[PDB]
């Protein structure tokens, strides 16, 4: 079943955003060496060993969990900034191993675009604030417009940006028509693709908030990884 090729490209994207030099090695090999998947309780931000459905980090299906009322919540329209309708109570994150230390954490985020649900990985430094990279691993927006979330030049703009402001509130901004420079939080919007851009904005506003990875990244900031 492939199914397998889907799992493998996901692993590829994780390795890609992790900034690991692939010394010719294959993806399943690099993933075992450098990646440690962990489950996270969103509300508390704590690492957990199992989800409510009994899954471990190795077999947890967060998308399926999000539609199971036993282990997810229904978001009000106002709460639902990323326009995803529901949120699993437990998330998965991918720790990047240096040696015995954790070098980065990669968090899965998503939000609705114009034509499609848009899924991305965001690589965060162990300060729990600085973005190391971003990659969209599933989206179906129009090439040349919203599809430009896959453009290397647009994604590179996220590198060095801070996720949070001084109150640890979500601070990433999709700035219509080009952010300034020396900008702490701002990246350029997608020209001609405001609706996709709004979906990206909502993605960060929700997933950096109290119902998302907010509590977790706070614990990262306070040294919860190493
Ligand atoms: Cl979710």
Residue ranges of domains in the chain: 1-226
How many Cα atoms within 13 Å fall on the side-chain side of residue 38? Answer: 21
**Exposed (0-12), middle (13-18) or buried (19+): which is 117, by Cβ within 10 Å?**
middle
d(CA 129, CA 123): 10
Asked if 18 and 123 count as a contact pair (C-beta separation under 8 A), the reply is yes
d(CA 197, CA 118): 11
Cα(87) to ligand 1 centroid in Å equals 4
Cα(91) to ligand 1 centroid in Å equals 7
Asked if 173 and 187 count as a contact pair (C-beta separation under 8 A), the reply is yes
Cα(65) to ligand 1 centroid in Å equals 7
d(CA 75, CA 83): 9
Cα(88) to ligand 1 centroid in Å equals 4
Neighbouring C-beta atoms of residue 218, cutoff 10 Å:
15
Residue 61: left (phi > 0), alpha (psi -120 to 50), or beta? beta
**Technique that determined the structure:** X-ray
Resolution of the experimental structure, in angstroms: 1.6
The answer for residues whose C-beta is within 8 angstroms of residue 138's C-beta and 6 or more apart is 117, 118, 119
SS3 content of the chain, % helix, strand, coil (to 5): 30, 25, 45
- Residue 6, Cα to own-chain centre: how many angstroms? 17
């Amino acid at each position: 079943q492939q199914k397998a090729n889907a799992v493998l490209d996901k692993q590829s994207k994780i390795i890609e955003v992790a900034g690991i030099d692939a010394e010719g090695k294959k993806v399943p090999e690099l993933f075992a060496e450098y990646i440690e998947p962990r489950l996270v309780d969103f509300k508390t931000g704590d690492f957990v060993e199992k989800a409510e459905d009994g899954s471990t980090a190795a077999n947890y299906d967060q998308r399926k969990a999000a539609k199971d009322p036993a282990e997810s919540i229904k978001l009000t329209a106002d709460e639902d900034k990323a326009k995803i309708l529901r949120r699993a109570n437990t998330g998965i994150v991918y720790l990047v191993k240096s040696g015995d230390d954790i070098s980065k954490v990669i968090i899965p985020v998503h939000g609705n675009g114009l034509w499609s649900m848009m899924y991305a990985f965001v690589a965060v430094e162990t300060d729990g604030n600085t973005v190391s990279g971003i990659t969209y691993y599933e989206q179906g927006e129009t090439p040349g417009l919203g599809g430009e979330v896959e453009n290397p030049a647009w994604r590179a703009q996220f590198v060095g940006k801070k996720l949070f402001d001084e109150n640890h509130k979500p601070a990433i901004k999709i700035v219509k028509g080009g952010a300034p420079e020396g900008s702490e939080h701002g990246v350029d919007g997608l020209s001609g693709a405001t609706l996709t851009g709004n979906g990206v904005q909502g993605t960060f506003d929700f997933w950096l908030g109290d119902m998302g990875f907010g509590p977790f990244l706070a614990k990262v900031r306070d040294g919860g990884l190493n």
